[PDB]
Amino acid sequence: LNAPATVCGPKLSTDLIKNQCVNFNFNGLTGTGVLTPSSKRFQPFQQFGR
């Protein structure tokens, strides 16, 4: 949960949902909140932001 990952477990995916409070599981990072498109630019070695 700190870096880009390519070895995952056996879990199905789901389509994205915007502008609505949901439970989310991004690469094993679980939480609750609202997802919005961003204008931030990430470097190729970066996955999360704090």
Partner: protein, 49 residues
Amino acid sequence: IEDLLFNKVTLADAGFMKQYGECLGDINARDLICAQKFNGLTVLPPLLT
């Protein structure tokens, strides 16, 4: 003279209403009042305007 006095202290709040869509947009600007309001800290208005 009260105008000259009110133009010499820079108040931090400048209005006690901050809508959810206002903090949801302009999210690239790291506003301090939005960050306080997202963690449960609020400022209440005075009784006498």
